[PDB]
């Protein structure tokens, strides 16, 4: 295998996610747990809003709540920055602009803590409309397939990405969320800096019929593409 960190993903890896958020002064926390199987680009996670009611729609948090679990095809193994940064990990930072509404700013560290892949996130949201699609909870509980476009940032020993998320609104229209992303390694070790490619990302949201807390069950399937065999 072409990076040392890639070896850590040959099996099923436990995942922990911890998010602290503040959107227009509405504070919240989310904890998630599950597991990832990068060989197949799959993960399964269950998230709980540990502070009671989530003040924003669950779908708006999907992108924030571990791209090291993507399946890179055999011919693309030298382009997997995310696993190459492991176990020391990477900082992932985004600004997410909701069209005609507010924005989220996120900073996360994704790294191994023992045998567990941990995503710890700080999220701040500002300039939302209290009666808009986000704070007004007008988004459908579902999720579309998206391509995440990745480019190397040699200057920061890292990568950049940008993409637009389409969130279906309750009335059949769409709330757009423009994502700008930067990832930089935490460690000083060498990482893989990729040629341009994308991650074809599929997400399915559901509920645990036994769960009384505000929560989201998420299954994701992701494969890298855009570099010909």
Curated annotation (Swiss-Prot):
Q: Effect of altering residue 146 to D? A: In Cerulean; leads to improved quantum yield, a higher extinction coefficient and is 2.5-fold brighter than ECFP
Quaternary structure note = Monomer.
The listed outcome for residue 173 to G is: In GFPA; leads to enhanced fluorescence at 37 degrees Celsius. In Venus; leads to yellow fluorescence, improved maturation and reduced environmental sensitivity
Q: What is the effect of changing residue 147 to K?
A: Increases fluorescence at warmer temperatures such as 37 degrees Celsius. In Esmerald; leads to brighter fluorescence. In VisGreen; leads to brighter fluorescence
> Entry's Pfam families?
GFP
Q: Name the UniProt key words of this record, in alphabetical order.
A: Chromophore, Luminescence, Photoprotein
**Result when mutating residue 174 to A:** In mut2.1; shifts fluorescence lifetime from 3.03 to 2.50 ns
- Full protein name: Green fluorescent protein
Practical applications according to UniProt: Green fluorescent protein has been engineered to produce a vast number of variously colored mutants, fusion proteins, and biosensors. Further generation of mutants led to more stable proteins (at 37 degrees Celsius for example) with brighter fluorescence and longer fluorescence lifetimes.
Lineage top rank: taxon: Eukaryota
The answer to whether keyword Glycoprotein applies is no
* Classification via InterPro entries: GFP, GFP-related, Green_fluorescent_prot
Changing residue 47 to L does what? In mut3.3; shifts fluorescence lifetime from 3.03 to 1.88 ns. In R10-3; matures to the red-emitting state with excitation and emission maxima at 555 and 585 nm, respectively
On tissue specificity, the annotation reads:
Photocytes.
